[PDB]
């Protein structure tokens, strides 16, 4: 009753086409990641298979609603009536969402107009080894990630304090390696089509 | 007639909000969960993985479907699951599933007078199952089947088994698609996990199993058991006979390391050594020493006492082994 | 081309039995052929098209049958209105004939 | 559904002539318009092919360059013109519509040429 | 004028159309008849322990709502129509995989009759599951099934029966499995009861006996042409050691990389084969015959058996083969 | 500017069922098709299935779509196809085909200004084509694609070569991805099945293909005659080797063995018998041939041994008597 | 600003028909092409094909999609791809692709303000290049990749590469698991199928396959294994049986490395570089093999001399026969 309303006077007016401040400033995006299971490292193809939780954060001014309540803690059917930013893996070779027994996403939207966006990713990435001193080798297997068509002064992408963390290293699906270390790491990509922030994770791994 | 239940169910979804759970400032929702296993299928070892048919059924009141009619319980089909609110049930270690749309979308819907609900689906539940093929195979894996909801935490979302907790997973005895293991047997708990974006309320159902060892006798055992009786052959012929002997040393050798690279050809490459690598590693040592022993024959020759010697102790020694492998790892 | 080569050039029988006719092409042609009348003093109609079917209008004692390369045509007891000229095309490639069998009593 | 031909000519040989058959019932876009020969005494000879929404044409080789075919679109109409007129050419003409399972479904009248 | 009234029948038939309440929803179940044509039935693997099946699934019922007093004939409807009809939730128990084809369009036919009988119909490639006992392999036969029930509609809402009798499933007769035989096939009419109620159940049932003709040219002569090699050495004198240990030991070892490739093309089963009991039957002729030659070196290096074991080995061996052809067939 | 041909298409859908077949209540729809052979795709032997990549081009008649404009034809775009009644051809003898979509339907729509229509569409289909491996691999099949109208009798939709029969499936000089067979040209047929719901009208489409022999000469028929001649070989050899005369029996058994079990790789597990297993039958009854000679030797060995009469008798007839089988079964099968 | 660009867009996609190409009764639309290839995944001989992921950008100027009262360039989500028009823009040589559709589908649509459309995508196409194992290993493969308009012709659309050779960049950092990017060339043509003259550009490589693995696995074992036969010429003729297990032995290495090699390759029915290797290989082996048979033969049935000789000649001619070899495929 209060809480349709609230949702039906955000929607009224909204475009999804357009990100937040279009003609004003940069959308500044805070990314989150939580990794499930860092899988099997390929060599054969030269890939490794990663699980996470990917969050994005942002701010939205047309998302602000005043009422008592504070968080809309919202399912994925309110995912495709909003702006979402187009975050696409750089290094990727094939990756999907998990779509049982519903779509695997969240949102919730604060009354500042805080957007918290996180969704379930498996991600077939690509670090070609160099594999040399094979068997006696170690490799830092990268996650790129940036926006596809909004360049860096459209969508400027940034890390938390507490961006990368993972779950337990004991259950995960390394064999022949171990999980040594990770790193995040921050750039600007030079394309056809703009300059682009690009966010990458590396993974250090050692052979087992 | 029919036409009644037409405008009921108009009735229901006109001022139902499917984005926002029964009860938002009310209470807590409370979904109730039963699984029903039509078959066990196939456990992959190379992956780690299980994989399980199952009926998972879901119950929870809603108290904006309340209706009243000549029917108690309308049974309705599946496209208005997408016009009502359900719970986003996730599994936590699920790798692939997926939900079956043959030749209807695989689901269920009724919706009791009361308000109560009831959502079945039948999907190919593919989750993870970790091993420790330390006692490889001798060993009995545990393969769990976590699920829990998404975006809703435990002040939101609760769920509950819908029966006892004993009777509350039944699997189907005409289905078990499981050739290697055997389900000995379930057990299910209630869990609170707790994660950076709040607490979450995890059902767990753990399967029991246990590896059948009858196919790696046959393929494994055996034909490695065989060929170190083979290497014994080589005590029992003549001392002068130098490249019989020879023939039988070098083919065991080979035979064993061929048998020792095929045995692994059911094995993530872990960092370990499983039970049967440590059969096959004494029984390369037994073929590798009765090479050992015609090479000393053939230093003193010119019926050696250390063939004669050799035709009793390298049985013995071998069947005492057999004696302390087979009785550690079987209890 | 395609050599159509229907035999024989005349039949002379009675009316009321059964008489077969047999059109032999050189190269196949898949269920393509056609059978057509020639009345003295008339234009062709159609009879048979592709290898047995009958066409609107066709009595049900006109049947025929075909194959990659061996067609006839048989004729179940034959009336005195039937002392045609019978012609054998095709039409898998550019469409050739047959010269033609005449009907006689 | 009738197909009505033009009347019988008398030139002489080594002359041209005109000669035509006019469709009623349809229309010739959809279906293709074949001419064909009848010698007397003797069997059907196809002359040519006409698709007369593609304007595409083609002939016998033996009727190459002596015979083609035309066409019109509002007068619903197919034409023949012959060239250098002997004494084999005195036959019978039929233009055939094309029809189910390409069958030659419809026939004009006949149209006789004489040379003297 | 008949597609412009055509259009008012199609019209005013889908216009108040309720998809969400199956036909006589406060009255009797409904009567949904089955037959299937059986188009080909595809690979049947052991290693997956299925069979791949496509066919043309057909189903009929009377829909009061859907019928009209006009067109006389039974109106073939575009098959995007089906999507706004109530059609019944059938599906395939035992279906690992399946899919409706879609080229160039969706395979579906609907079928209206004036009286409102509904014939919807469906061409599925469906990879049902079939448990096999590979225990008399290769010479077994499996009882394959495919079980059609209606997943939420219980027997006091939906009604399923083989239209037809055995004239239900047709097609059977003409499919050519390249290593298996359609000995018979059945029909059955069920009722199973599960924990939300009864439901209706058919089951299309189908027993292939396996061929023999390819395991003769790819196993079993292989398994007995070292039998016939490893008798050679009982020829070859007593002088010639490394002679008889070649013709021994290299039968040893063809016999054993025989049985472990033979037994990759095969899932992990933990019982013993029939083709196992041939080639452990094989192997320990093979063995026994190097182990003859080890007796025959003790005797005359160590401190008429050599015409004994010519005799016995090829005759207890033939005769090992008539007990395992006429009890495995 | 665009205004016009906007309210010629608006025109055109408005009041217009795609339910309904052109003249439902009136005649039978008369559907003109024409097959582009893109690429004929690999042959699969084990699965007895062939690809094939075409350009299934589909016209018909549409007395609803007639307009009167500045344009001729309209050349529109895939989203015009889905909005028209299409026919529902499906193929007969397919089992998975794609209608490629990258990057956009991959599809085509002409409606002339009569109602005329032409509907292309890029498709690979992969149909079953049943094989006769009894002269494999000297062996040639006629690979069918049969298509038709599901749902739509003989009495509703009926389905015609635009072109004529000869002229109606193109294939194209450069699309031949076949690197075992060779094409020897199409062949195609107009017929009518039954089933168990009426008369269909069904067009079949036969591929003439013919396997070529020169990966099995080199695979299998080759090294089976070195095999046989290197037993051949062992009767030129001392009479008293009781060892080297046996170990090239017993290698020659082994490889013709081993050829005779990899010679069964990708075809399929069929009950008879190729010419190329009667082939290996006869090489194998040659290779142990030398064994049975050899065992007759060494059972007849014993102030020198002498040069066996068995060893002369098979220096001269064991390579005569392959060379009379060669002769026979190499003009028995190629012959025709 | 906000109501601005809102309107604006509104503006824009109010009135737009999605079934009718710019200049739709008018003059060809023209589109320029830009591809950056991410990478060259996996090229493949036994289905002839290879895998490719790129960038694939489109230029074209759309005159109802103008907007001035926003200077600034418009990019916008990629659900209005679905809205706008867009050419049909279609792979031949293609058998299987798919736009990458993490987190969203990879997708872009920048409006600019003169009318001028930057859609791009995100392509994974396994396209088909047939190749010639004429010479292999030691070949020169060659593949492309065809992008013509597919129901679109000469007069309703034109090709271009957009920037010329700048279309199609990033080949130089595509390391290929065994080949090597020698040239890449653009080619742009028209092509007359029986429905029209449609347009077609197209993007072509040369890989030339490296010669480490093939000459460490294939070439240098084949030569050793012979090296190894020519040790049967040294030995006295009455050890029978370890000449005759040499020649055996040597000969069933060659019979299982030509199996073992050519198991992988397609069921090609010519004749390559390494099989004509291989079959003069085994040809000296089984030279060697008669040779003994030969020799045992003189003795025996009927010596120092023949295998004297052998041990020269066999040399002189495998060195002769790897010259003429080598020239011919190099
Ligand atoms: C060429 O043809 C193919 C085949 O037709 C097309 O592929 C299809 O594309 C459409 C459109 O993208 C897909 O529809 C959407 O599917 C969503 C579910 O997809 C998942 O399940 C299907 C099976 O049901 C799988 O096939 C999918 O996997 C595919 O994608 C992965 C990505 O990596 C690939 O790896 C796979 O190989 C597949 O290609 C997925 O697993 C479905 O959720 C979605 O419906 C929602 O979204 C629409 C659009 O907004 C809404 O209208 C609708 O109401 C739904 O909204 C809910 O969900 C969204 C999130 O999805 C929320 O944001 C909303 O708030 C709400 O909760 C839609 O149905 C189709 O599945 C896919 N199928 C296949 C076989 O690929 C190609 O696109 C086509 N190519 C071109 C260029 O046209
Ligand atoms: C495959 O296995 C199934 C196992 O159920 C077989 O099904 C059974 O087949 C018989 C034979 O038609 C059916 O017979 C009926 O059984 C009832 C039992 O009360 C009896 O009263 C009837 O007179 C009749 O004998 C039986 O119902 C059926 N059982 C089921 C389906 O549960 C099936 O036949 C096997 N297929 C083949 C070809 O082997
Ligand atoms: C792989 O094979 C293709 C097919 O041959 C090669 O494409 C060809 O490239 C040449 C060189 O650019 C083209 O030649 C052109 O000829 C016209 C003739 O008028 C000339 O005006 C041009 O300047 C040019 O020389 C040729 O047309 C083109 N072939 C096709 C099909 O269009 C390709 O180069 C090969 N791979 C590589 C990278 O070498
Ligand atoms: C908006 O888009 C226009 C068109 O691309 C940009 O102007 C061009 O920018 C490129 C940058 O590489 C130059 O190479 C061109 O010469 C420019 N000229 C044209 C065609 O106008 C413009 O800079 C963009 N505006 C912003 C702020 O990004
Ligand atoms: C999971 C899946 O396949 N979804 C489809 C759904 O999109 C479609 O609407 C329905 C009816 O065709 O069938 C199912
Ligand atoms: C990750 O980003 C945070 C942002 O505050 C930074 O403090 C931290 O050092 C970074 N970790 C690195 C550089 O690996
Ligand atoms: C409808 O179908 C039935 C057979 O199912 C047939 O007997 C009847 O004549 C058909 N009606 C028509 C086409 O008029």
């Not at chain 2, 009644?4 to 409370?30: A, H, K, M, V, W």
Request: a neutral charge.
């Amino acid at each position: 009753g209060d809480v349709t309303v609230i949702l039906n006077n955000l929607l009224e007016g909204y475009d999804n086409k357009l990100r937040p401040d279009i003609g004003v400033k940069p959308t500044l995006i805070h990314t989150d990641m939580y990794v499930n299971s860092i899988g099997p490292v390929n060599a054969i193809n030269m890939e490794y298979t990663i699980d996470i939780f990917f969050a994005q954060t942002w701010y939205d001014r047309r998302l602000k609603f005043n009422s008592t309540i504070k968080v809309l803690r919202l399912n994925s059917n309110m995912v495709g009536k909003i702006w979402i930013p187009d975050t696409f893996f750089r290094n990727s070779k094939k990756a999907d969402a998990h779509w049982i027994t519903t779509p695997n996403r969240m949102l919730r939207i604060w009354n500042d107009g805080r957007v918290l966006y996180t969704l379930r990713l498996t991600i077939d990435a690509e670090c070609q080894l160099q594999l040399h001193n094979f068997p006696m080798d170690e490799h830092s297997c990268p996650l790129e990630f940036s926006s596809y068509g909004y360049p860096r002064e459209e969508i400027v992408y940034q890390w938390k304090r507490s961006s990368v963390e993972v779950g337990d290293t004991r259950s995960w699906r390394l064999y022949q390696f171990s999980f040594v270390g990770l790193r995040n790491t921050t750039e600007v990509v030079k394309t056809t089509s703009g300059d682009y922030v690009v966010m990458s994770v590396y993974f250090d791994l050692s052979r087992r | 007639n029919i036409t009644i239940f037409t405008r009921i169910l108009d009735r229901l979804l006109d001022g139902y909000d499917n984005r926002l759970r029964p009860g938002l400032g009310d209470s807590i929702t409370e979904v109730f969960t039963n699984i029903y296993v039509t078959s066990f299928g196939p456990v992959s070892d190379t992956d780690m993985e299980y994989t399980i048919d199952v009926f998972f059924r879901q119950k929870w009141k809603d108290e904006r479907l309340k209706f009243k009619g000549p029917m108690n319980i309308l049974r309705l089909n599946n496209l208005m699951a997408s016009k009502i609110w359900t719970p986003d049930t996730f599994f936590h270690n699920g790798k692939k599933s997926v939900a079956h749309n043959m030749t209807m979308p695989n689901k269920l819907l009724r919706i009791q007078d009361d308000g109560t609900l009831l959502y079945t689906m039948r999907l190919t539940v593919q989750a993870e199952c970790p091993m420790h093929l330390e006692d490889f195979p001798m060993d009995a894996h545990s393969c769990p089947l976590k699920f829990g909801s998404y975006a809703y935490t435990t002040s939101e979302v609760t769920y509950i088994w819908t029966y006892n907790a004993s009777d509350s997973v039944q699997v189907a005895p005409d289905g078990s698609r499981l050739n290697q293991y055997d389900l000995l047997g379930q057990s299910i708990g209630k869990e609170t996990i707790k994660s950076s974006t709040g607490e979450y309320t995890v059902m767990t159902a753990h399967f029991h199993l246990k590896r059948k060892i009858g196919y790696f006798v046959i393929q494994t055992y055996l034909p490695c058991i065989m060929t170190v009786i083979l290497s014994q052959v080589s005590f029992w012929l003549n001392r002068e006979s130098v490249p019989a002997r020879t023939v039988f040393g070098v083919t065991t050798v080979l035979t064993m390391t061929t048998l020792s690279i095929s045995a692994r050809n059911s094995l993530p490459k872990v960092a370990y050594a499983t039970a049967m690598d440590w059969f096959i590693a004494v029984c390369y040592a037994f073929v590798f020493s009765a090479l050992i022993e015609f090479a000393t024959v053939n230093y003193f020759t010119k019926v050696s006492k250390i063939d004669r010697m050799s035709r009793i102790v390298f049985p013995v020694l071998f069947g005492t082994f057999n004696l302390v492998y087979w009785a550690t790892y079987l209890n | 081309n395609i050599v159509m080569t229907q035999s024989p050039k005349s039949m002379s029988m009675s009316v009321g039995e059964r008489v077969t006719l047999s059109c032999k092409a050189s190269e196949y042609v898949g269920t393509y052929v056609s059978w057509y009348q020639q009345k003295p003093e008339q234009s062709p109609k159609l009879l048979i098209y592709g290898a047995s079917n009958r066409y609107t209008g066709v009595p049900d004692r006109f049947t025929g049958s075909g194959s990659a390369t061996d067609f006839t045509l048989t004729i179940g007891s034959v009336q005195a209105e039937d002392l045609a000229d019978y012609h054998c095309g095709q039409s898998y490639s550019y469409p050739t004939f047959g010269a033609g069998t005449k009907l006689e009593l | 559904v009738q197909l009505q031909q033009s009347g019988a000519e008398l030139v002489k040989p080594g002359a041209s002539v005109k000669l035509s058959c006019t469709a009623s019932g349809f229309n010739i876009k959809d279906t293709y318009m074949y001419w064909v020969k009848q010698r007397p005494e003797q069997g059907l000879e196809w002359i040519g092919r006409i698709d007369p929404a593609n304007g595409d044409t083609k002939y016998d080789p033996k009727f190459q360059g002596k015979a083609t075919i035309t066409t019109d679109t509002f007068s619903n109409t197919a034409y023949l013109q012959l060239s250098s007129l002997t004494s084999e050419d005195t036959a019978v003409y039929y233009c055939a519509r094309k029809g189910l399972r390409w069958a030659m479904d419809y026939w004009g009248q006949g149209t006789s040429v004489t040379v003297s | 004028g008949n597609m412009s009234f055509v259009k008012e029948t199609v019209d005013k038939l889908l216009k108040g159309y309720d998809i969400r309440l199956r036909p006589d929803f406060g009255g009797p179940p409904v009567c949904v008849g089955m037959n299937i044509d059986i188009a080909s039935i595809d690979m049947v693997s052991e290693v997956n322990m299925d069979y791949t099946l496509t066919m043309y699934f057909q189903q009929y019922w009377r829909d009061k709502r859907l019928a009209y007093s006009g067109i006389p004939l039974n109106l073939t409807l575009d098959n995007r129509v089906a999507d706004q009809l109530w059609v019944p939730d059938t599906y395939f128990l035992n279906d690992k995989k399946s899919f409706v084809h879609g080229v160039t369009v969706k395979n579906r036919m609907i079928r209206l009759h004036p009286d409102g009988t509904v014939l919807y119909g469906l061409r599925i490639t469906t990879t049902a599951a079939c448990m096999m006992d590979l225990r008399r392999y290769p010479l077994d036969e499996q009882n394959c099934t495919l079980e059609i029930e209606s997943y939420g509609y219980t027997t006091d809402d939906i009604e399923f029966y083989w239209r037809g009798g055995d004239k239900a499933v047709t097609g059977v007769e003409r499919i050519e499995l390249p290593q298996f035989s359609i000995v018979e096939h059945r029909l059955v009419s069920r009722n199973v009861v599960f924990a939300t109620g009864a439901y209706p159940r058919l089951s299309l049932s189908f027993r292939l006996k396996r061929n023999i003709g390819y395991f003769i040219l790819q196993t079993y002569m292989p398994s007995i042409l070292i039998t016939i090699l490893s008798w050679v050495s009982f020829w070859i004198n007593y002088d010639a050691s490394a002679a008889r240990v070649a013709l021994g030991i290299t039968t040893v070892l063809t016999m054993t990389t025989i049985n472990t490739h033979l037994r990759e093309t095969l899932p992990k089963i933990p019982y013993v084969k029939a083709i196992d009991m041939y080639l452990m039957g094989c192997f320990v002729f093979v063995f026994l015959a190097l182990l003859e030659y080890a007796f025959v070196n003790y005797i005359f290096f160590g401190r008429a058996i050599d015409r004994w074991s010519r005799i016995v080995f090829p005759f207890t061996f033939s005769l090992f083969n008539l007990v395992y052809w006429l009890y495995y067939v």
